[PDB]
């Protein structure tokens, strides 16, 4: 199983990016897919989770309202639409598969991450 994040980059405050996470070796349709982020030296922190279609998306306090997670099951890809970006959002963003279909966060597979830098 492999995950690959893309879509990061340098973006101005208030601006928008859309991160993508492409999975191979695993059908994502049965699994929740989550986004985490890690600023240097800090702990890797939860951002968002897209559960299976119909089971809802959930978000961290810091990104609620500005970020939206969404899924393309057919293409084994999950997305993080990031609007109204803040300096505080600068981090490496990571995608992870929840291997537990009952949603207990058994994150066995992780991507390598994609850098997001929000500054002018």
């Amino acid at each position: 199983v492999q995950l690959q994040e893309s879509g990061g980059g340098l973006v101005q405050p208030g601006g928008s990016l859309r991160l993508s996470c492409a999975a191979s070796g695993r059908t994502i349709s049965r699994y929740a897919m989550s986004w985490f982020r890690q600023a240097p030296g800090k702990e890797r922190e939860f951002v968002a989770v897209a559960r299976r279609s119909g089971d809802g998306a959930f978000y961290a306090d810091s990104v609620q309202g500005r970020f939206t997670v969404s899924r393309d099951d057919a293409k084994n890809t999950v997305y993080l639409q990031m609007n109204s970006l803040k300096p505080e959002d600068t981090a490496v963003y990571y995608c992870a598969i929840d291997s537990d279909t009952f949603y207990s966060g058994s994150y066995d597979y992780w991507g390598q991450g994609t850098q997001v830098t929000v500054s002018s």
Binding site: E45, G56, F58, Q64, F102, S104
Partner: protein
């Protein structure tokens, strides 16, 4: 009867749908009931499409295919309870396993605490070890007991609170019960917790 969604989360005023898979019964039309915690279930919809006299108009029926569904158009802050579908049959009806709406709220990871058995209890011949997962959301969590790093099975029980009316969280207790003699054979007592809000398991432990 198998209601498809089982823990449908939602926020106030929005629209939600709930479906009851016809388990290829006689397929006589469903009749949705509602029940709040610890009270008498009320009627909501009979013959799958009509309302019960004196029931707010937010509700609705639908007879999509052979998958009967209910749709709350706008969610009043009052409607938060378990819902039941009831299909007739040849000569015995049967209620569905039932789903339960709940209040949307941004994920909260548990705070974890461990408690050793008291000397008073031990002197009586039993050791209860308690692990507390406090104020978390959503409800799903796992507690694993390890005793000298050995995973335990069959000697613990869990209780979970009802959702808190103010902060919409749960708390959970796991109690490991050992004989005094078994308790005194081991040193390290650990409860290891996972939850979707935790990036890595949280372990709380003590040395006997």
């Amino acid at each position: 009867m198998t209601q498809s969604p089982s823990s449908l989360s939602a926020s106030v005023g929005d629209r939600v749908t709930i479906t009851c898979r016809a388990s290829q019964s006689v397929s006589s039309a469903v009749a949705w009931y509602q029940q709040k915690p610890g009270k008498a279930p009320k009627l909501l919809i009979y013959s799958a499409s009509s309302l019960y006299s004196g029931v707010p108009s937010r509700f609705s029926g639908s007879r999509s295919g052979t998958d009967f569904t209910l749709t709350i158009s706008s969610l009043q802050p009052e409607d938060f309870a378990t819902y039941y579908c009831q299909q007739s049959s040849s000569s015995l009806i049967t209620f569905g396993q039932g789903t339960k709406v709940e209040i949307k709220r941004t994920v909260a990871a548990p705070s974890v605490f461990i408690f050793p058995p008291s000397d008073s209890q031990l002197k009586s011949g039993t050791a209860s070890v308690v692990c507390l997962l406090n104020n978390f959301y959503p409800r799903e969590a796992k507690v694993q007991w390890k005793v000298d790093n050995a995973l335990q099975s069959g000697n613990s029980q869990e209780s979970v609170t009802e959702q808190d009316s103010k902060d919409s969280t749960y708390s959970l207790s796991s109690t490991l019960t050992l004989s005094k003699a078994d308790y005194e054979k081991h040193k390290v007592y650990a409860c290891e917790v996972t939850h979707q809000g935790l990036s890595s398991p949280v372990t709380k432990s003590f040395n006997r």
